[PDB]
Design a protein around this nucleic acid. Structure first.
Lengths: 281, 282, 281, 282
DNA sequence: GACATGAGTGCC
DNA sequence: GGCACTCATGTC
DNA sequence: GACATGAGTGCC
DNA sequence: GGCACTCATGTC
């Protein structure tokens, strides 16, 4: 029973719902009143269970004893996932109209940059429900099961996914060039060459990211947004985004989205999860 | 306020005593009952006071209003510095007669890898104290002061240090080379080339760190041990260490410490803080 | 005097007109009857005088006494400069109509690969007159003067351009990026990185040259043509060539030329000095 | 046919003698009175023949019909191979007593850097004789046999040795590292990485050369000597030279040889060919 | 201590 | 000889 | 969506 | 011209 604070408002329905859609089976359990998922901090494994208390602007978090040792980090990863630092008063006060409808919006982070990297790559070209399935199986194959909670399994580590048989992965339902992008990224992780935290110069780190085999501008962006919780990104090479800016080209979009600096990550979320939106005259 | 649990025993006097020796004026403050320093997380800043309660083997952390928005990432920082994850019954067991002198011995980590990167560099050649004096100058010079707390000053940030003139840093009391290194490290932080988190493959990653100008095996090993809290890395290159195996080569020494696997970071710490430990008269 | 012959025809009035245009004040003198310049081959320096004997198909090459110990290399420099190895029967008899008005057409080489390297970079963008004027400047600042020939000066060497001050080269009237290009090339020449002789895989080579900052595809081509006298390279990136093929783009052209392989470098010339030439629409 | 000049003295006996001993079969021929080998220059092949005229102080160069369009470059090649540019008064008058006995000594260049690389490589660890037979086999397989003079085959081109199976080369009588070395060399060759002419900064170039697999410091040196005809390199690594400097190590030798700058390459040849030469008492 | 560097030491 | 690998110097 | 191509564009 | 970025485009 640990507890963290958040500034109101906080749209849990939206947040959870979003995690739900993308929830990988066996690993994540998203329910209308709580989120709980397996988790590893090195060799310490167990299970996290966040339970927002909309009442007392607090997010209670329970930890399995196999993680009590690394309570701090765990507690810290959760805070990155649910964007607890956000001050909506500032963000919506900067976006106005755009964020005025759903002021409780928050940037859906992650509980580990490497997991996200994989999540990102596997999210390419396919749909959400589809990807959360392709991942589930990938987790199924290289994921450490919790001797303390068989039901849950840990996300494939970089070393586990580094010693990955390409055809083995490809045989799970992805081009080989995809599984090659992973085995690679997995290595970066191992040799600490993959920024596990948001860097000072994000533009750089991203360009630098766009070199990794299999990682392009859309993946690098979506990765900086979700993996580094970078607050000022935007995905103008995104299927959905293109539809919200009819005709407009990625450049036209990037150009446009500048009116929302320095909170383009949020402007983005407000546009994605807001059907029918369209640019101004 | 916020509190974190730990596994006894815990040599707080030793831990505080160690931190205080390397403390940097205007940035830290260590007493016998608590530790306190400035701290930055993103743009959020302020003060973290850490008070241990030996009776409840619990650490009470207090953040100034400036940090609450990133409280969690703060506690993580602290627990990493203090090594609260350590379970003495395991380490002390595996090492045995080695650390039984003081089992509460913990591995002093850091609250930030970059700062520790800067510290391990200026920590080159000079004495612990002198290194603490230099880091102080660079901090006073390139650090930012806290509004909420005038007295305190934040550690120099990566960007501020990248955009710094080698001469100025040189003038502080360090060779130009040393200064080029500080400035180099600063960018790997901005570019994200310098790991702020313990990488899966330490060995490799450390090797990679040595490609960096100013970072030899020693700075790599050490940084690995402090900045990442790596628990199975020995320092045969270290000064006092060569003096602990009087008349011995880094490979025999490094070959020696292989019995203390996989907690050579801990076996190392026990050697240092053992007034007169001479290799087992075998 | 020394003699080296050639296979007729040989348009000397054209060849000489060519070098004349790109002549470099103080390094070369060119009249309708002869070519002459300063020439260095290590610590051996002097003036090379070449006089064509159209009458009996032979080129006379006189050499200043300082170059006498390295006559052979001096003649090879001249032979490569004037493409005397050429056989107009083979080339012209493989270009057909394209090469019929001027069969005495030869491929203008160089006397020093590095020099041509420095020339190519400087020929970038500016016109021929300016390029020549510009190169003359660089020579004046960094070239060695001759004791027997005060009027002449040797083209600057790599040890001198590699140690040049970017800002000084900048001052001479060139983009800092450009001066940094000469200095980088100079360093390559010092390390043995710059191919001084037509390399096995011309294609590959040019690809490795483009990695040199300052060197693009046009520069890596004109350097190959003039610098290695490589006989099979086209230049759709070239201005005059661009328009010799109006409408056609650097792929259409590049494919059209395929028809001329492996003498595409000559093809390039004839089309260049044939004001009125049209492809087959 | 063509004639090139040279400054006296010129020890032809020594020179032809040196070339002969390393003469590769089917590629070159060496007789008391002349030197003749196959020569390719792009799509032009023929046979070059050199006959030194001691009276006129000239080297007569003959070329088979195939090479007449690239005649001058063939002369330029021969000139490098026979060190014709050398002014023995400069060297000897500076090299001191070292080469007073045989003032007509010259630097045996080569007629193609690549061939020379191949030869420096093939010649590692084995006797001059073995190297010759070794190379000969290599040439007889991947080389272009001339049609006008069947007993002559042009030394293998880059693109040819580049495509060679690392196993055939092994078959001819050599390890495998050695064979990949040639294929690596052949590759550097194709892309323009192997310097075919003496580089502006020799020391640098050698440093770089040693990065090539198969090429160490010896090979790197022996190549700068024969392959680029650099006049100021020494071989503190050669077996023979080590014997000429008893009990000294590459470092002492090299430092001792510094007394022969800028003509260290010549000093080397003199020493190499001096039964029982020995440094000065110390 | 970082780093250039010399030196010895086996193996392929 | 190339190459891996490890002591031991000698500036800064 | 990544990634070669090309083909154009525009800022040095 | 060198280049970094851009707007399709066909493939996987």
């Amino acid at each position: 029973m640990y507890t963290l604070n958040w500034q109101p408002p906080y749209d849990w329905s939206w947040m959870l719902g979003f995690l739900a859609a993308r929830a990988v089976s066996s690993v994540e359990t998203v329910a209308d009143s709580y989120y709980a998922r397996s988790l590893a901090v090195g060799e310490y494994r167990g299970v996290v269970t966040a339970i927002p208390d909309i009442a007392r602007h607090t997010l209670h978090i329970n930890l399995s004893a196999g993680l009590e040792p690394v309570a701090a980090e765990c507690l810290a990863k959760m805070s990155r996932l649910f964007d607890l630092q956000c001050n909506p008063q500032i963000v919506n006060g900067a976006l106005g109209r755009l964020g005025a409808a759903r002021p409780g919006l928050r940037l859906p982070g992650c509980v580990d940059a490497f997991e996200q990297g994989v999540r990102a790559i596997l999210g390419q070209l396919v749909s959400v429900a589809m990807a959360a399935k392709l991942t589930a199986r990938v987790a199924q194959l290289y994921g450490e099961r919790l001797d303390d909670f068989p039901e849950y399994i840990c996300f494939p580590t970089p070393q586990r996914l580094a010693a990955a048989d390409p055809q083995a992965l490809k045989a799970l339902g992805m081009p080989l060039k995809r599984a090659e992008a992973l085995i690679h990224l997995a290595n970066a992780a191992l040799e600490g060459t993959l920024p596990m935290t948001i860097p000072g110069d994000v533009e750089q780190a991203m360009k630098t990211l766009q070199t990794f085999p299999g990682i392009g501008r859309w993946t690098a962006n979506y990765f900086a947004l979700r993996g580094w919780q970078a607050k000022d990104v935007f995905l103008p090479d995104d299927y959905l985004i293109k539809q919200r800016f009819p005709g407009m080209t990625p450049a036209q979009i990037r150009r446009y989205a500048e009116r929302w600096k320095p909170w383009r990550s949020y402007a983005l979320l407000h546009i994605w999860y807001t059907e029918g939106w369209q640019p101004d005259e």
